[PDB]
C-alpha cells in the first residue's frame, strides 16, 4: 500500500499548528519551511486518471489537471455544448466549509464561454484574478468586455471600473434571458507566476477587499480564483485567506495543514517553497493587526 494511499494519508493527517506568538516570534527556519514544503505530496492526477476525451484542448498545461472528485462539471443548462469539462475545482474554505472557492485557470480563447457558463451555473458573484503586466496572450486573455459583449448565451456588461492602488475592481453584470446578476471582478496584477507579490500589504488588502465584499445571495456561491495555471498564485491567495480566518478565530494557524487540504481539492496548490515562505511572512504580519 500504495503511493496513492500514502499520499492521501499524508495530506489528511500532516499538521503544524503555530500560535500567533510562534508565528511572530519564533517561526520555523527557512530551512525547515523548505524541507517541510518538499515533503508535501503534489496530488497531481495523471492523464490516465481522467477519462475525458478532448479535455487537452481545454487545458493550458498538459500536466495541470482538475482532480476528478472535486472537478467542476459543466451541466450545460444554458447551452448545447459537447462536454462537461472545464479545468476547475471546488475548494473548501475555513474549517472545511464546502465550495467556498473555485480554483481555475484563466480562460483560454476557446474556454471563455465555458468560464462564464461556470460563473452562471455556480452563481458566482465574486471573481478574483491574479496576474502580471508582462503576461501574454498564451498565459492570460481579457475575457470580459470593454462595454458590452455576448459570450455564448450571456450578456456581460461592465457597470463600473474603479482603480484602487493595488488592484482594479470591476462591477459587471451577466444576464441570461430575463435574469441579470451582479459579479464583482478584482484584478490584482504585479504578481508574476512562480513568484510572490511585491510585499504582503497588497495581498492582505486584496484579501480584505474580498472579505468586505457584500454577500448579496441566500445560498452564496463559490468565489472564483484564477491565474494562468490556477494553482500557484490561486493557492497563495486562498491559503492566505483561510490562514487569516484561522488566526482571527483561534489565535493559531496550521499552514502545513491548510496547504495539504488545498492539494486534496486541487493538486499542485502553491508552487514554490518561496511562496510557502511568503505565506508565513504574510500571516505573521496579519497577526500583528489583530486585536487585543
Amino acid at each position: 500500500n500504495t503511493p496513492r494511499e500514502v499520499t492521501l494519508h499524508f495530506l489528511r493527517t500532516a499538521g503544524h499548528p503555530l500560535t500567533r506568538w510562534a508565528l511572530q516570534r519564533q517561526p520555523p527556519s527557512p530551512k525547515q519551511l523548505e524541507e517541510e514544503f518538499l515533503k508535501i505530496p503534489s496530488n497531481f492526477v495523471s492523464p490516465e486518471d481522467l477519462d475525458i476525451p478532448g479535455h487537452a484542448s481545454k487545458d493550458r498545461y498538459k500536466t495541470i489537471l482538475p482532480n476528478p472528485q472535486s472537478r467542476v462539471c459543466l451541466g450545460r443548462a444554458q447551452s448545447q455544448e459537447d462536454g462537461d469539462y472545464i479545468n476547475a475545482n471546488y475548494i473548501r474554505g475555513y474549517d472545511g466549509k464546502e465550495k467556498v472557492y473555485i480554483a481555475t485557470q484563466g480562460p483560454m480563447p476557446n474556454t471563455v464561454s465555458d468560464f462564464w457558463e461556470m460563473v452562471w451555473q455556480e452563481e458566482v458573484s465574486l471573481i478574483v484574478m491574479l496576474t502580471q503586466l508582462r503576461e501574454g496572450k498564451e498565459k492570460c486573455v481579457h475575457y470580459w468586455p470593454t462595454e458590452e459583449e455576448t459570450y455564448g448565451p450571456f450578456q456581460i456588461r461592465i457597470q463600473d471600473m474603479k482603480e484602487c492602488p493595488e488592484y482594479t475592481v470591476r462591477q459587471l453584470t451577466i444576464q441570461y434571458q430575463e435574469e441579470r446578476r451582479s459579479v464583482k471582478h478584482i484584478l490584482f496584477s504585479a504578481w508574476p507566476d512562480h513568484q510572490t507579490p511585491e510585499s504582503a500589504g497588497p495581498l492582505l488588502r486584496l484579501v480584505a477587499e474580498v472579505e468586505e465584499s457584500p454577500e448579496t445571495a441566500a445560498h452564496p456561491g463559490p468565489i472564483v480564483v484564477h491565474s494562468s495555471a490556477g494553482i500557484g498564485r490561486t493557492g497563495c491567495f486562498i491559503a492566505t485567506r483561510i490562514g487569516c480566518q484561522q488566526l482571527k478565530a483561534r489565535g493559531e494557524v496550521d499552514i502545513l495543514g491548510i496547504v495539504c487540504q488545498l492539494r486534496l481539492d486541487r493538486g499542485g496548490m502553491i508552487q514554490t517553497a518561496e511562496q510557502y515562505q511568503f505565506l508565513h511572512h504574510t500571516l505573521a504580519l496579519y497577526a500583528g493587526q489583530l486585536p487585543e
Side-chain angles (χ1 to χ4, degrees), residues 1-4 6-47 49-61 63-79 81 83-116 118-132 134-136 138-146 148-158 160-197 199-215 217-218 220-292:
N1 90 277
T2 116
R4 198 146 184 54
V6 127
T7 292
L8 299 174
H9 186 68
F10 190 89
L11 302 165
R12 294 188 163 130
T13 60
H16 190 188
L18 296 160
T19 54
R20 274 193 60 183
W21 182 89
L23 198 53
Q24 282 165 341
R25 301 275 145 215
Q26 208 191 65
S29 68
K31 194 74 218 263
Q32 296 160 323
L33 296 186
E34 293 181 349
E35 257 157 4
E36 188 183 275
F37 177 73
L38 287 180
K39 281 179 169 60
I40 306 174
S42 79
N43 198 34
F44 289 133
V45 267
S46 56
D49 291 339
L50 287 171
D51 189 6
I52 301 128
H55 74 70
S57 62
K58 285 142 164 281
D59 300 314
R60 184 167 284 104
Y61 302 110
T63 51
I64 293 162
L65 299 189
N67 306 58
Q69 44 288 119
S70 53
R71 159 172 98 84
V72 176
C73 296
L74 301 184
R76 298 305 177 188
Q78 279 69 48
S79 73
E81 248 88 283
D84 73 353
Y85 184 81
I86 183 181
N87 191 316
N89 291 91
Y90 304 113
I91 309 306
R92 301 176 279 138
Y94 173 70
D95 216 48
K97 181 133 101 95
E98 267 170 30
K99 304 195 178 180
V100 177
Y101 309 86
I102 278 173
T104 183
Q105 65 192 25
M108 290 161 82
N110 61 310
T111 70
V112 172
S113 307
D114 296 329
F115 184 87
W116 295 117
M118 186 172 65
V119 169
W120 188 261
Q121 168 185 294
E122 291 301 322
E123 284 174 33
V124 175
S125 55
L126 181 57
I127 299 167
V128 181
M129 171 174 161
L130 319 142
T131 195
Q132 174 48 280
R134 272 197 217 165
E135 222 163 64
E138 61 288 338
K139 283 188 162 157
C140 149
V141 344
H142 171 290
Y143 61 87
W144 61 93
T146 277
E148 161 130 2
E149 297 280 299
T150 285
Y151 305 87
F154 304 108
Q155 273 309 83
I156 312 271
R157 100 160 293 263
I158 192 163
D160 175 292
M161 193 144 64
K162 176 194 46 190
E163 230 115 43
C164 304
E166 291 122 355
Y167 47 84
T168 297
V169 181
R170 271 169 188 100
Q171 293 292 347
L172 315 163
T173 59
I174 164 153
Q175 145 154 31
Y176 177 63
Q177 304 266 77
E178 86 295 334
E179 192 184 340
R180 195 165 57 259
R181 284 174 194 177
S182 283
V183 179
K184 195 182 180 188
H185 193 262
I186 304 161
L187 190 166
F188 183 108
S189 22
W191 195 347
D193 63 86
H194 285 94
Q195 280 178 40
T196 73
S199 59
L203 182 54
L204 284 176
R205 285 180 286 267
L206 168 69
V207 170
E209 177 60 37
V210 157
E211 285 302 334
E212 322 146 351
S213 277
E215 180 98 286
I223 288 157
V224 168
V225 185
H226 73 78
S227 58
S228 312
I231 54 165
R233 287 154 300 174
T234 83
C236 299
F237 172 73
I238 279 162
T240 294
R241 176 150 179 256
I242 287 173
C244 295
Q245 294 164 305
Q246 304 181 3
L247 283 168
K248 192 185 184 175
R250 307 195 290 250
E252 68 174 48
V253 69
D254 191 343
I255 289 153
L256 169 51
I258 277 155
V259 178
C260 280
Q261 299 292 328
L262 294 177
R263 303 218 170 147
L264 287 170
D265 305 339
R266 164 177 187 81
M269 298 296 261
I270 313 227
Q271 278 183 313
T272 76
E274 176 187 31
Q275 290 171 336
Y276 198 61
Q277 293 170 326
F278 194 81
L279 263 162
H280 294 68
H281 173 89
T282 308
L283 286 172
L285 216 77
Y286 178 73
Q289 77 203 359
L290 288 186
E292 101 189 354

